[PDB]
Amino acid sequence: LSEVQKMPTMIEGFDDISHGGLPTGRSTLVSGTSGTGKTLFSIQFLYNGITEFDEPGIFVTFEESPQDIIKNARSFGWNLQKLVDQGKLFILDASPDPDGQEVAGGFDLSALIERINYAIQKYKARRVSIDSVTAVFQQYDAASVVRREIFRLVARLKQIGVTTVMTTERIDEYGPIARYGVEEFVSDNVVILRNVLEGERRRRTVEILKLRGTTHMKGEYPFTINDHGINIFPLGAMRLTQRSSNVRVSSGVPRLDEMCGGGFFKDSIILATGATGTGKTLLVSKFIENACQNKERAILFAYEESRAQLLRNASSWGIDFEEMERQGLLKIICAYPESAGLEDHLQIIKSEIGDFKPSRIAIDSLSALARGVSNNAFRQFVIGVTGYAKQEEITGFFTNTSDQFMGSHSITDSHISTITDTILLLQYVEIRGEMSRAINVFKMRGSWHDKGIREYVITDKGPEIKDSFRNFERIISGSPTRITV
Amino acid sequence: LSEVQKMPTMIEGFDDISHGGLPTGRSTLVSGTSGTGKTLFSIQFLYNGITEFDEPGIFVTFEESPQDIIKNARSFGWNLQKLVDQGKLFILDASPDPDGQEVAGGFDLSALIERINYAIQKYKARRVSIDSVTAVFQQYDAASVVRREIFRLVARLKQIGVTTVMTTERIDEYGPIARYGVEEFVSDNVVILRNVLEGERRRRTVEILKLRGTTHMKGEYPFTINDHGINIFPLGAMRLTQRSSNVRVSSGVPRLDEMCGGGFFKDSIILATGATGTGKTLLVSKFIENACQNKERAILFAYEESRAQLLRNASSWGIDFEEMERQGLLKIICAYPESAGLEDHLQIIKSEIGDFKPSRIAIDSLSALARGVSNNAFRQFVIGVTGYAKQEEITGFFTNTSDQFMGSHSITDSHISTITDTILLLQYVEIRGEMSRAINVFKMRGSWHDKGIREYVITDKGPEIKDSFRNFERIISGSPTRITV
Amino acid sequence: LSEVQKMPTMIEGFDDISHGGLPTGRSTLVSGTSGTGKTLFSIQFLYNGITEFDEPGIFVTFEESPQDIIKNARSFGWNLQKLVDQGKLFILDASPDPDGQEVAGGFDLSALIERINYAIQKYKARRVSIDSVTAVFQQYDAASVVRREIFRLVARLKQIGVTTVMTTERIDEYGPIARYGVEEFVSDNVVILRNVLEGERRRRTVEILKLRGTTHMKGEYPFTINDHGINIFPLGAMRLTQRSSNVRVSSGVPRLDEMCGGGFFKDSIILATGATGTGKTLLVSKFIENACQNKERAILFAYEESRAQLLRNASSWGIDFEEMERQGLLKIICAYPESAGLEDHLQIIKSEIGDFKPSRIAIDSLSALARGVSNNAFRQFVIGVTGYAKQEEITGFFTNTSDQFMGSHSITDSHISTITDTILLLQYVEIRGEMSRAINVFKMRGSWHDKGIREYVITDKGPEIKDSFRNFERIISGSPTRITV
Ligand SMILES: Nc1ncnc2c1ncn2[C@@H]1O[C@H](COP(=O)(O)OP(=O)(O)OP(=O)(O)O)[C@@H](O)[C@H]1O
Ligand SMILES: Nc1ncnc2c1ncn2[C@@H]1O[C@H](COP(=O)(O)OP(=O)(O)OP(=O)(O)O)[C@@H](O)[C@H]1O
Ligand SMILES: Nc1ncnc2c1ncn2[C@@H]1O[C@H](COP(=O)(O)OP(=O)(O)OP(=O)(O)O)[C@@H](O)[C@H]1O
Ligand SMILES: Nc1ncnc2c1ncn2[C@@H]1O[C@H](COP(=O)(O)OP(=O)(O)O)[C@@H](O)[C@H]1O
Ligand SMILES: Nc1ncnc2c1ncn2[C@@H]1O[C@H](COP(=O)(O)OP(=O)(O)O)[C@@H](O)[C@H]1O
Ligand SMILES: Nc1ncnc2c1ncn2[C@@H]1O[C@H](COP(=O)(O)OP(=O)(O)O)[C@@H](O)[C@H]1O
Ligand SMILES: [Mg+2]
Ligand SMILES: [Mg+2]
Ligand SMILES: [Mg+2]
């Protein structure tokens, strides 16, 4: 008599991919291999319901004992025992009793359905989570029997009018959606949780395969499990709207600011690319030093150099990062790119930005984060970081180490130049057998910028941008040819 | 006694691939994994029949309850309850009753066939849709029994003379066409719906494998599910006929118009390619500004820069996009390439063009749309966009960011240059250690165009195209060599 | 009533990936193919418990006889017989007796559980290891029966309150986690041991798939089995904190030290890259000679040249490595890269550093170690070596043979330049048909360094760094062009 209403799950990123949550009064199928977060998803569904909408929830477990479920939920800061004592949550223990011997007859799904209905009526439950129906159906080896029993369960829960989340099982990550293969077709809604193993690394993704009668974002979306539960990131949080401003921000190098027409833009992304030793880290350090000298908070996400090495280099360049950190203006987060996946790094960056509320951020060596990851996943990560930084009106400074040290015919082999607003090209220039460096403002959207490929030297005082090689040809090749007069 | 007549389905793009629709008086097999749109296809078949030809339809469901089918159809704006009340549609509920216990004997297909025949005679039905015969046949584990029962059903429905759509099931996207493997050979017509997972993205494709006694377009064809149902796009809508005209349209840069022999052609595709920062977005902005200054509607499909960043850059270039939007002359659609698949982007572009009726369109950075997609799918998308724009007599301006910033030996690594009519090559030119830019009209079909590689500078007033580097060699390499006199 | 406490295993690297060990009072599933170290892991778990925390352990074996288990443990220096005699360890022999005939009834898991409970009560056991439950469950061909029995066992061991390690079985390295496929879902914790075969080489990795109610590091982590048991290396031991100092260390070439602004840094990584014959080994030899002349211990990890060939070349260069070794100041470890995997090489390097306590280390030809290994695994190895060296305040000198001998447009095709602090670029320079060499300090973090591409010749006295090619262009190409005056 009406359209397909949805019930928000309040799981970060799930409601966005599901376009409003799970459909109301229907059964949703959550399928995934071991460790994919099925139990976590089901528990978070009820917990969020109870906490945000005061909707009593029912949890049906067939393997994990209720005590173990409550003990598990605490790792996320969830006190399920408090909810149980308040009558808001009820954990229906349907696990086989050890004292109960094997039964040769078809397991009584009718008794379980009656118990669930009684619990729903008693606690006025609006949400139901069913843990590992596959444990129930393994006694039902036949696939037809399994489909019939799932159909009975879904139809009964539908007649009761409760929103249900059923966790099922799969052997392969990209094989059958569920074990028997009849689970994904009896359910109205199918959610797939994967733990893809790529490059000796586990990537967790969530996919909404079908929402009968409703639109949803298609494909796999990476998600992480942290102290707050499941955190899904829908493809860079789409576009949104961030009103870019003309406000200028200094780069810490006055000559570079002149080269940029008055410094960088506050709501812009700066990309300093070049070969190793070109001074990208020096520009990042001067950027952070300028940020903090103006009593503005900043963060330095490093991924190649340790904290102490950064400190030593900054001190050698006349920058006291220790005093900056003591003043509470600078927070240096360094970490090896491998230590965690790109989604984990994005979550850490978001959390640090939220806790510190910085005005500027400097990520060192995006190339380091691109190690051993597919170009598509890397691009998704950069989209996420850039969008999040622009949304908070945060000035971003990113560095990318070019793989070729001279003759580099591309700005970035990952092709992130299309996403950045300002591009600083740093390169070596062979001059009289000496390896001079050159800095050029390759790109600046919305601002005039010096086209000069200007020489600069690195001293104890920082970078000193000199004149341009106005008597040389093919500087870009790294090996220019000098012309008389 | 006659040839093989076909019954139109009126599903956008299906009748084209099927060369007139589904054959009349025969059973069509619609096979696909979970969430492929089998139920949607079957429902749309009957709904389109009833609404466009007043042909009563019969829907046979074995899992989804009739109430749920009616509730599902509303997401597409279809009021199936109205049709049921009018006697034009009948939903035959054949789902197993929960109160009915298991039956050890072969399920009575004869009773179902008799019920379907009675319904067809009562409602004078010309169309029939059968939902998940696989649910029926899972009780028939044996494949031979399944083939026999499908043969009986198809033969009976054929004797009745109704056009039937049967939805069947598969475990793998590219595995067996159906579960048992006997379904695709008893049916006269086989349609395969796939939800291929590639690059963490779901691509939906429809394939007509065989139409016994009729020709059909071969292979997979992408299709999307939106608020209007299934929308199939047959390989760029073939050729068609768009009478190109000699009418000229200004580019917003008078010197560029002179370089093009009087501006671009109205019914032509313009491709501005170059490295990052070369000013492709500037040319797009001037193009849109010229379009709107002449009181002509235009659309800007951006995929790298946000709306506000485009606004800021345009204002910095003396272009007021806000006033343009207020006047109803400009509509700016920006969106990340990942947010949706290429078919979805094509559908969005088509819908926006239809709703706005623009005279010009400007897509920013086709390269952004090529991220993480196969070259073939990208090429298909460009063919679609170019053909649709040319059909509506719309002038298209596309930008492609070259992956190499100097020495680019190709116009486009995706090789779309063969599809575009006008090509504007933008490149950096190293001159006296300064990174000057160069604009050249690489290509212009049906018009004389300046061969000069002309220098241009970007100011607050826009691009100023200066003279050509007439005293330099190897400009194209990016690092030219100057010659005296 | 409390959070999820964990029990340390004291297995090197396991507690780090598991974030504190195995959860207390729960069953952990250790699955892996033949030879993956399941039995070794289970035995080490109990042995470490007993030896470090005085926690009595119970070992349940179904195939390996207790005598054979004790005999096996001695290869790691573990005297399990001493623990058994002390009552700290009990090996419960549950293997089928040869005199016991086949049983058609379901094997009595209840009797085994009662025996285990009796043993736990008698020895006050806190840890339990179960060897090859799969041998038990093969008589239970049915997967449902297997899941039920595993559930009974886990629930009973949980009620007893002991931490349990259960070793299960798999046929494929990346196939089902366990044989039946029900083992990984009844267990609260799943650990996967793999012996991946890549390039005719076996790579052993450990993965913690899920720790219910606790966070853990995700993905595969390489581990080796040596005379001390399982040794896991969690992704380079994360970041840690190594306070870099400004202390300078001589390179053995005074002119090179001048080029580096006073020599290399003590807590830094030096990378000498160049074509074959450029003199990387000469720089390594002079580095070691300077290390030992100052009465400082050093190690030379070679991977291309034999010990005697290194001796001969050093003597030809006026360096007496034999006297250095006799004095106990130099230890030369040479070995073919293939002889062992990257994890094995890392373990050997760590062990040698620990036994010798060197002040400097010189690894010859990282490129040799990159032969036939994925770039990701190689990068992980370099991260490990660099981090370990920096942690011990050890100066590292690494050499990388460039694959291209002239025109090399990159420092390292493996792109390790981002990880190194000092980069010495060695290259050939064609001059008047003579193949002169050139040395340039490409990079030096935290120090001024000469930008000059200086010629050097190799004599019996070592390298003699001459002036720079100040009258030549395109030296970097290898084929420079001379200019008059
Ligand atoms: N506080 C936490 N922070 C981060 N990750 C956590 C946290 N608690 C649990 N996890 C992770 O979440 C996963 C838990 O999965 P969950 O129990 O929800 O279901 P599942 O793995 O889909 O199915 P199964 O019931 O077979 O375990 C584990 O792999 C664990 O690593
Ligand atoms: N209004 C809509 N707009 C866009 N997509 C929709 C809309 N309504 C439904 N969908 C999508 O269409 C799909 C519905 O598939 P459908 O029910 O027709 O059959 P099927 O997936 O082939 O088979 P099954 O019966 O197993 O679900 C879902 O995956 C859903 O995402
Ligand atoms: N002292 C040692 N040093 C190095 N490697 C060792 C040592 N002792 C044993 N190994 C290795 O450890 C492995 C022993 O594996 P383990 O017996 O622990 O269990 P598993 O291989 O997982 O299972 P299974 O019970 O089927 O053998 C062997 O492959 C052997 O090469
Ligand atoms: N005190 C100094 N004087 C002059 N140059 C220095 C000094 N300290 C460091 N440098 C230079 O700084 C360079 C490092 O720059 P950095 O920003 O770390 O490069 P990257 O592009 O890899 O981030 C060194 O290669 C060296 O040339
Ligand atoms: N006010 C201005 N004056 C001169 N140049 C400008 C001005 N604003 C922007 N630019 C130039 O515009 C360039 C951006 O051009 P754009 O069309 O966005 O490049 P793309 O080819 O990436 O689309 C900047 O790199 C800068 O050189
Ligand atoms: N006594 C010598 N006099 C001059 N040159 C020598 C002498 N002994 C060896 N060389 C030079 O040393 C080079 C080897 O340098 P080495 O460090 O082994 O190169 P790599 O970069 O491969 O490690 C030889 O190619 C040769 O040019
Ligand atoms: Mg750096
Ligand atoms: Mg652009
Ligand atoms: Mg060598």
CA of C247 to the centre of ligand 9 (A): 28
Residues whose beta carbons lie less than 5 angstroms from ion ligand 8: B 281
In short, whether C68's Cβ falls inside 6 Å of ligand 3 is no
Find the CB nearest A75 among C158, C214, C267.
Answer: C214
Question: How far from B114 is each of A165, B96, B109, B120, CA to CA, in Å?
Answer: 38, 17, 9, 10
**Residues lining ligand 1, judged by CB closer than 6 Å?**
A 32, 34-40, 75-76, 193, 225-227; C 185, 210-216
3-class SS string, C256-307: HHHHCCCCEECCCEEEEEECCCCCHHHHHHHHHHHHHHCCCCEEEEECCCCH
Q: Can you give the C-alpha Rg of chain B in angstroms?
A: 28
d(CA A212, CA A216): 10
Q: 3-state class of C2 per DSSP?
A: coil
CB contact under 8 A, A246 and B277: no
CA of C285 to the centre of ligand 9 (A): 10
Contact in structure between C431 and C472 (CB atoms under 8 Å): yes
Instruction: Provide φ and ψ at C44, rounded to 5°.
Output: -65, -35
Report CA dihedral (B251, B255, B256, B262) to the nearest 10 degrees.
Answer: 70
For residue C210, give every residue at least 6 positions away whose Cβ sits within 8 Å of its Cβ, in sequence order, or none: A34, A35, C189, C190, C216
d(CA A193, CA C13): 28
The DSSP symbol for C105 reads: S
Element (H, E) at B431: strand B422-431
Question: How far from B433 is each of A455, A476, B452, C483, CA to CA, in Å?
Answer: 9, 9, 22, 20
Q: Which atom of ligand 2 is nearest to the CA of B193?
A: 22
Element (H, E) at B233: none
For A113-146, the DSSP string reads HHHHHHHHHHHT-SEEEEE-HHHHHTT--SHHHH
CA-closest candidate to residue B342, choices B227, B208, B198? B198
Q: 3-state class of A91 per DSSP?
A: strand
Q: 3-state class of B351 per DSSP?
A: helix
Contact in structure between C47 and C80 (CB atoms under 8 Å): yes
Gaps after residue numbers in chain A (C–N over 2.5 angstroms): none
Contact in structure between B32 and B38 (CB atoms under 8 Å): yes
For residue C13, give every residue at least 6 positions away whose Cβ sits within 8 Å of its Cβ, in sequence order, or none: C221, C223, C231, C232, C233, C234
Find where tokens 């007649």 sit: A159
Q: C451 to chain A: which residues are within 8 Å by CB?
A: 434-436
d(CA B197, CA A221): 12
> A454-459 and A434-444 as β-strands: parallel, antiparallel, unpaired?
antiparallel
Q: Can you give the C-alpha Rg of chain A in angstroms?
A: 28
Contact in structure between C53 and C214 (CB atoms under 8 Å): no
**Residues lining ligand 4, judged by CB closer than 6 Å?**
A 274, 276-282, 316-317, 399, 458-460; C 443-449
Q: C390 to chain A: which residues are within 8 Å by CB?
A: 306
For C193-230, the DSSP string reads EEEEEETTEEEEEEEEEEETTS----SEEEEEEETTEE
Q: C213 to chain A: which residues are within 8 Å by CB?
A: 71-75
B343 is catalytic: no
d(CA A392, CA A242): 8
Residue A457 — left, alpha, or beta (φ > 0 → left; ψ -120 to 50 → alpha)?
beta
CB contact under 8 A, B277 and A220: no
Instruction: Give the distance from residue A159's alpha carbon to the nearest chain C alpha carbon, in angstroms.
Output: 30
What is the identity of the amino acid at C161?
Answer: G
Contact in structure between A403 and A256 (CB atoms under 8 Å): no
Element (H, E) at C444: strand C434-444
How do the residues of chain B divide into helix, strand and coil, expressed in percent and rounded to 5? 35, 30, 40
Find the CB nearest A177 among B34, B134, B407.
Answer: B34
* Beta-bridge partners for B221: B206
CB contact under 8 A, C475 and A480: no
For B24-43, the DSSP string reads TTSEEEEEE-TTSSHHHHHH
CB contact under 8 A, C238 and A339: yes
> C298-302 and C330-334 as β-strands: parallel, antiparallel, unpaired?
parallel
User: What are the start-end ranges of the E strands in A239-309?
Assistant: 248-249, 264-265, 269-274, 298-302
Q: 3-state class of B400 per DSSP?
A: strand
C63 is catalytic: yes
Instruction: Provide φ and ψ at C188, rounded to 5°.
Output: -75, -35
Neighbours of A128 (CB within 10 A): 24
Contact in structure between C300 and C310 (CB atoms under 8 Å): yes
What is the identity of the amino acid at A418?
Answer: T
CB contact under 8 A, C410 and A432: no
d(CA A361, CA A268): 11
* Beta-bridge partners for B150: none
Contact in structure between B259 and B321 (CB atoms under 8 Å): no
- Closest chain A residue to the Cα of B96, Cα to Cα: A148
CA of A482 to the centre of ligand 7 (A): 31
d(CA A382, CA A375): 10
- What resolution does the deposited structure have, in angstroms? 2.5
**Solving technique for this entry?**
cryo-EM
d(CA B25, CA B29): 13
What is the identity of the amino acid at C280?
Answer: K
Query: Is the C-alpha dihedral spanning A31, A36, A38, A44 positive or negative?
Result: negative
d(CA A41, CA A37): 6
Q: A4 to chain B: which residues are within 8 Å by CB?
A: 71-72, 74-75
d(CA B203, CA B36): 10
For residue B68, give every residue at least 6 positions away whose Cβ sits within 8 Å of its Cβ, in sequence order, or none: A158, A188, A212
Report CA dihedral (A65, A71, A74, A76) to the nearest 10 degrees.
Answer: -50
Contact in structure between C399 and C270 (CB atoms under 8 Å): no
As separate numbers, helices (DSSP H) first and strands (DSSP E) second, chain A gives 15, 24
d(CA B462, CA C249): 56
* Beta-bridge partners for A265: A248
Q: Do chains A and B touch (3 or more CB pairs under 8 A)?
A: yes
d(CA C100, CA B284): 86
Interface test with C, best of A30, A31, A34 (most C CBs within 10 A): A34
d(CA C59, CA A361): 54
Contact in structure between A261 and B459 (CB atoms under 8 Å): no
d(CA B19, CA B13): 10
